[PDB]
């Protein structure tokens, strides 16, 4: 119940939320059903429009306006953004030369550059190149001031999730708003974009930016409008604000503009109806532009012009129904389109299986335009799995494509042209960064990069301290002109040690064999000097990693390769070799197939075993560094010991195989060399956190050696690809992978066809960040290069996409 009977004189737009059942003058009243009964009246004016003309310059002040042209609006704040051109014979801020701005020019009381973050939903990063003739405050801002050509969203690459990313720094799993629609089974409710429901505290978790200014003495512009405010007011109302005097005025704003999204749904991302809504907001952002040169504002002000995600073509005839696939159908919720997510429609039936409904949705038809998954199985990158909202079944949906459940659903509901929602590696769902003014650079194009990154920055815009999130702080240093944050590497928690020869062969009751008694001072020296690590810095290129948690872990050494071996795990956390381009590829010689050999290095009581594996009809085993990629005949045998074997399914071995037999080599050849670095992942929890030994739900059977979830491998080369990877004196280039380790191919719809045909499309949907890898295993790499440290949390920080 609100008493609509108090008024809004003098409180339009007011930064407090007064508290029920009071009424309401905030830009947030309006969806709440809770203004005052003159909140339209005072707060909403549009008499006059939003324009000065000619004839309007130096009237009597006529508060019915919408906005002023009167000699006293400067003063009082509310001319119309157009006011000193039409009036005072200056220019637009558009037509303008863009000249640096070196310092911030503020006037008296303004204490920091203000952060102005403007939004604007569905803007497709192509728009900044293919509507910039439409465009030119927006194309102004972008060439004048650093832009990205695109930025990564979050998957869903849907509006609310995408949104609070921005605001939170922090992953959808994270922030729980998981999707535009979600069920939460602890609270047993619902989440919709209609109505007053998605306000409650309850979805929003982490620290979104207002809340971590007001924390910390930094006072918020309120960052939610209701859909009926114009544009035009949105803008009036935050120059406003900006007139307030010092310690009432806010230092962070935000706009939000529901287009070219709109538009976008209706007329595909270029639809020809499509360049009305970019001019209008560019109009728009020239009104912002324009209202902050009046303010003498326009090279104090730090503006942030960005988008949630992209647009796709999609249309109703491009629906998959799962009517068509399963027999149980009504059993089934799903939440449907660019994504799908499946749950039981009661939980009273005890005849739902997961497992029945997964294997009805896989590979069942030839072009099959959508694919099943376990979440736990979604791609790392992704993000998507740790939280309760998030179905377990889970339904990555091709781009252009829908999912419904029946084909009533979608003509009882082409009404639409254009969605989102789509995998956040899809190019069609990229968006927008730039940033604009002193603390940003001058003239400078940044790399892409994702939006988790976003909240870093605005809390160093802003002097505050970001609340823990998902963005790596630092990483977006190269944006800044001043402000960056300094990051230092952290400390090694765990120290490796460096066994020698400490074991005799029969101290060993492995089960293992190998066909090895095939053998000097010349080469032996030599062999004793390899393992004492004579060949590392050809290996180990950019120093150990670091373990930043309590284990025992031993370094090897071998000529080809370095491995960090863990006493407690029984396997490496890591095993680092470079392969040049003149690396050859050999075989596994007939008589070292089943070769297993005990490494004297490592006690038998820290080692695998080979009846472990013998007895597990389900897991084979694998190597982390090639025996196909070893140097010499002599130095293969190094290949086969016991520490460098990590178990591994069949169906996975063919996956492997083909990486290290024919990829890797493909890498070197291209990339002038690659170095390696390869090994598990446990996380059994899918919380992208690396397992403690407590998580592992999963043992070679009869045995304490733990089955990982994932295999990962990091490949770093010269980004200067005429210097080799192992002299390479500039910047680098890196590629990872975090590959699930799945006892089936069931994911590959072409797995019986030849690994040439499959393998490397599966890698490409399982790349990742370094970043991802570090998550996932407690380790630090990257710990001795040349590079600055800001450059290598950059390069920690990026994703080799495969989009062209
Ligand atoms: C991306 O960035 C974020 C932020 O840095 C990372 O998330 C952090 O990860 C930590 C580890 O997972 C986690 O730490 C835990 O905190 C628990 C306290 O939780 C509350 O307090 C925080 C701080 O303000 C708050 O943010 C939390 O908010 C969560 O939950 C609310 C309501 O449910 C949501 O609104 C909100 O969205 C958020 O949910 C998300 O996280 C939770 C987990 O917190 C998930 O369940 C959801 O799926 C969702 O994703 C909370 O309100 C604390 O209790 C934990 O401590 C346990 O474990 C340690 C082990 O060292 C031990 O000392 C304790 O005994 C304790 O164990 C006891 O409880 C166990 C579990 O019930 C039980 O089994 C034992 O027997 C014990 O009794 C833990 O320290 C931190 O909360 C989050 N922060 C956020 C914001 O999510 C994220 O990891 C990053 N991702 C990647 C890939 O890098
Ligand atoms: C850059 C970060 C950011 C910018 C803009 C954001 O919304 C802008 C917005 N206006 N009107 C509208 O329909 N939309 C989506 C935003 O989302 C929210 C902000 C608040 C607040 N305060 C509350 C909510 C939930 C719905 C109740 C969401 C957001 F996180
Ligand atoms: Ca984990
Ligand atoms: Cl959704
Ligand atoms: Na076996
Ligand atoms: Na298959
Ligand atoms: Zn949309």
Same mark, same amino acid.
């Given at each position: 119940?609100?008493?609509?009977s108090?008024?809004?004189?003098?409180?339009?737009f007011?930064?407090?939320?007064?508290?029920?059942?009071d009424?309401?003058?905030?830009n947030?009243?309006k969806?709440?059903?809770?203004?005052?009964?003159?909140?339209?009246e *005072?707060?909403?004016?549009?008499?006059?429009?939003?324009?000065?003309?000619?004839?309007?310059?130096?009237?009597v !002040?006529?508060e019915?306006?919408?906005?002023?042209?009167?000699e006293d609006?400067?003063?009082?704040?509310?001319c119309?953004?157009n006011?000193?051109?039409?009036?005072?014979?200056?220019?637009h801020?558009?037509?303008?030369?863009?000249?640096?701005?070196?310092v911030?020019?503020?006037?008296?009381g303004?204490?920091?550059?203000?952060?102005?973050?403007?939004?604007?939903?569905?803007?497709?990063?192509?728009?900044?190149?293919?509507?910039?003739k439409?465009?030119? +405050?927006?194309?102004?801002?972008?060439?004048?001031?650093?832009?990205?050509?695109?930025? !990564?969203?979050?998957? /869903?690459?849907?509006?609310?999730?995408?949104?609070?990313?921005?605001?939170?720094?922090?992953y959808?799993?994270?922030?729980?708003?998981?999707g535009?629609?979600?069920?939460?089974?602890?609270?047993?409710?619902?989440?919709?974009?209609?109505?007053?429901?998605?306000?409650?505290?309850?979805?929003?978790g982490?620290?979104?930016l207002?809340?971590?200014?007001?924390?910390?003495?930094?006072?918020a512009?309120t960052?939610?409008?209701?859909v009926?405010? /114009?544009?035009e007011?949105?803008?009036?109302?935050?120059?406003?604000?900006?007139?307030?005097?010092?310690?009432?005025?806010?230092?962070?704003?935000?706009?939000?503009?529901?287009?070219?999204?709109?538009?976008?749904?209706?007329?595909?991302?270029f639809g020809?109806?499509?360049?009305?809504?970019?001019?209008?907001?560019?109009?728009?952002v020239?009104?912002?532009?324009?209202?902050?040169?009046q303010?003498?504002?326009?090279?104090?002000?730090?503006?942030?012009?960005?988008?949630?995600?992209?647009?796709?073509?999609?249309?109703?005839?491009?629906?998959?129904?799962?009517?068509?696939y399963?027999?149980?159908?009504d059993?089934?919720?799903?939440?449907?389109? #660019?994504?799908?997510?499946?749950?039981?429609?009661?939980?009273?039936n005890?005849?739902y299986?997961?497992?029945?409904?997964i294997?009805?949705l896989?590979?069942?038809?030839?072009?099959?335009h959508?694919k099943?998954?376990?979440?736990?199985? *979604?791609? @790392?990158?992704?993000?998507?799995?740790?939280?309760?909202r998030i179905?377990?079944?889970?339904?990555?949906?091709?781009?252009?494509?829908?999912?419904?459940?029946?084909?009533?659903?979608?003509?009882?509901?082409?009404?639409?042209?254009?969605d989102?929602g789509?995998?956040?590696?899809?190019?069609?769902?990229?968006?927008?960064?730039?940033?604009?003014?002193?603390?940003?650079?001058?003239?400078?194009?940044?790399?892409?990069?994702?939006?988790?990154?976003?909240?870093?920055?605005?809390?160093?815009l802003?002097?505050?301290?970001?609340?823990?999130?998902?963005?790596?702080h630092?990483?977006? +240093?190269?944006?800044?002109? #001043?402000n960056?944050f300094?990051?230092?590497?952290?400390?090694?928690?765990?120290?490796?040690?460096?066994?020698?020869?400490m074991?005799?062969?029969?101290?060993?009751? *492995?089960?293992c064999?190998?066909?090895? @008694?095939?053998?000097?001072?010349?080469?032996?020296?030599?062999?004793?000097?390899h393992?004492?690590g004579?060949?590392?810095?050809?290996?180990?290129?950019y120093?150990?990693?670091?373990?930043?948690?309590?284990?025992?872990?031993?370094?090897?050494?071998?000529?080809d390769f370095?491995?960090?071996y863990?006493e407690?795990?029984l396997?490496?956390?890591?095993?680092?070799?470079?392969? &040049?381009?003149?690396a050859?590829?050999?075989?596994?010689?007939?008589?070292?197939?089943?070769?297993?050999?005990?490494?004297?290095?490592?006690?038998?009581?820290?080692?695998?075993?080979?009846?472990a594996?013998?007895?597990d009809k389900?897991?084979?085993?694998?190597?982390?560094?090639?025996?196909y990629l070893?140097?010499?005949?002599?130095?293969?045998?190094?290949?086969?010991?016991?520490?460098?074997m990590?178990?591994?399914?069949?169906?996975?071995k063919?996956?492997?195989?083909?990486?290290?037999?024919?990829?890797?080599?493909?890498?070197?050849?291209?990339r002038?060399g690659?170095?390696?670095?390869?090994?598990p992942?446990?996380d059994?929890?899918?919380?992208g956190?690396?397992?403690?030994?407590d998580?592992?739900?999963?043992?070679?059977?009869?045995?304490?050696?733990?089955?990982?979830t994932?295999?990962?491998?990091?490949?770093?080369?010269?980004?200067d690809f005429?210097?080799?990877?192992?002299?390479?004196?500039?910047?680098? &280039?890196?590629?990872?992978?975090?590959?699930?380790?799945?006892?089936?191919?069931?994911?590959?719809?072409?797995?019986?066809?030849?690994?040439?045909?499959?393998?490397?499309?599966?890698?490409?949907?399982?790349?990742?960040?370094?970043?991802?890898?570090?998550?996932?295993?407690?380790?630090?790499?990257?710990?001795?290069?040349?590079?600055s440290?800001?450059?290598?949390?950059?390069?920690?920080?990026?994703?080799?996409?495969?989009?062209?």
């Amino acid at each position: 119940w609100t008493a609509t009977s108090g008024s809004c004189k003098g409180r339009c737009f007011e930064l407090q939320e007064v508290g029920p059942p009071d009424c309401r003058c905030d830009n947030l009243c309006k969806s709440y059903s809770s203004c005052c009964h003159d909140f339209d009246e *005072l707060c909403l004016k549009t008499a006059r429009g939003w324009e000065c003309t000619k004839d309007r310059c130096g009237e009597v !002040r006529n508060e019915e306006n919408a906005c002023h042209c009167s000699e006293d609006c400067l003063s009082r704040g509310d001319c119309c953004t157009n006011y000193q051109v039409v009036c005072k014979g200056e220019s637009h801020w558009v037509d303008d030369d863009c000249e640096e701005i070196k310092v911030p020019e503020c006037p008296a009381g303004f204490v920091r550059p203000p952060l102005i973050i403007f939004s604007v939903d569905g803007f497709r990063a192509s728009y900044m190149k293919k509507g910039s003739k439409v465009m030119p +405050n927006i194309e102004k801002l972008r060439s004048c001031g650093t832009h990205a050509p695109y930025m !990564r969203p979050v998957y /869903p690459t849907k509006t609310f999730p995408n949104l609070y990313t921005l605001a939170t720094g922090l992953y959808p799993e994270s922030h729980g708003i998981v999707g535009n629609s979600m069920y939460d089974p602890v609270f047993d409710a619902s989440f919709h974009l209609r109505g007053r429901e998605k306000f409650n505290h309850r979805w929003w978790g982490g620290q979104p930016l207002w809340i971590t200014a007001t924390k910390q003495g930094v006072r918020a512009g309120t960052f939610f409008w209701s859909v009926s405010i /114009p544009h035009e007011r949105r803008i009036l109302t935050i120059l406003q604000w900006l007139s307030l005097p010092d310690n009432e005025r806010p230092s962070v704003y935000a706009f939000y503009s529901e287009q070219p999204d709109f538009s976008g749904h209706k007329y595909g991302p270029f639809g020809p109806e499509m360049t009305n809504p970019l001019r209008e907001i560019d109009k728009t952002v020239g009104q912002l532009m324009d209202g902050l040169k009046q303010l003498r504002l326009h090279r104090c002000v730090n503006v942030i012009f960005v988008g949630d995600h992209g647009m796709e073509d999609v249309t109703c005839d491009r629906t998959e129904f799962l009517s068509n696939y399963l027999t149980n159908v009504d059993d089934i919720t799903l939440v449907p389109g #660019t994504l799908g997510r499946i749950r039981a429609k009661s939980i009273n039936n005890s005849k739902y299986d997961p497992k029945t409904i997964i294997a009805a949705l896989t590979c069942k038809k030839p072009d099959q335009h959508f694919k099943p998954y376990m979440k736990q199985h *979604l791609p @790392k990158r992704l993000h998507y799995a740790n939280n309760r909202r998030i179905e377990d079944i889970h339904l990555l949906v091709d781009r252009r494509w829908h999912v419904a459940r029946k084909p009533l659903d979608v003509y009882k509901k082409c009404f639409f042209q254009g969605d989102h929602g789509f995998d956040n590696k899809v190019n069609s769902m990229q968006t927008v960064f730039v940033g604009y003014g002193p603390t940003f650079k001058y003239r400078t194009k940044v790399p892409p990069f994702e939006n988790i990154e976003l909240y870093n920055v605005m809390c160093d815009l802003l002097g505050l301290k970001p609340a823990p999130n998902n963005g790596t702080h630092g990483s977006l +240093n190269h944006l800044l002109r #001043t402000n960056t944050f300094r990051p230092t590497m952290p400390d090694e928690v765990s120290r490796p040690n460096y066994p020698g020869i400490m074991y005799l062969q029969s101290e060993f009751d *492995l089960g293992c064999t190998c066909d090895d @008694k095939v053998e000097n001072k010349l080469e032996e020296l030599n062999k004793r000097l390899h393992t004492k690590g004579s060949t590392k810095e050809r290996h180990l290129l950019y120093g150990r990693p670091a373990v930043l948690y309590r284990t025992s872990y031993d370094i090897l050494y071998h000529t080809d390769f370095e491995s960090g071996y863990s006493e407690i795990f029984l396997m490496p956390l890591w095993t680092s070799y470079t392969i &040049s381009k003149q690396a050859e590829v050999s075989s596994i010689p007939e008589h070292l197939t089943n070769c297993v050999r005990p490494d004297v290095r490592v006690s038998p009581g820290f080692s695998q075993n080979c009846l472990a594996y013998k007895n597990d009809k389900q897991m084979s085993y694998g190597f982390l560094f090639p025996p196909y990629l070893s140097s010499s005949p002599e130095a293969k045998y190094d290949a086969f010991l016991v520490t460098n074997m990590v178990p591994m399914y069949p169906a996975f071995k063919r996956v492997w195989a083909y990486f290290q037999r024919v990829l890797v080599k493909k890498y070197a050849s291209e990339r002038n060399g690659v170095n390696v670095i390869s090994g598990p992942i446990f996380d059994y929890n899918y919380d992208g956190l690396r397992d403690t030994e407590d998580e592992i739900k999963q043992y070679v059977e009869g045995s304490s050696i733990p089955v990982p979830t994932h295999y990962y491998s990091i490949i770093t080369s010269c980004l200067d690809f005429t210097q080799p990877a192992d002299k390479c004196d500039g910047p680098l &280039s890196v590629s990872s992978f975090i590959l699930p380790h799945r006892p089936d191919n069931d994911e590959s719809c072409n797995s019986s066809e030849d690994e040439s045909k499959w393998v490397e499309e599966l890698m490409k949907m399982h790349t990742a960040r370094v970043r991802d890898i570090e998550h996932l295993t407690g380790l630090d790499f990257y710990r001795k290069t040349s590079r600055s440290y800001s450059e290598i949390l950059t390069l920690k920080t990026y994703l080799h996409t495969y989009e062209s």
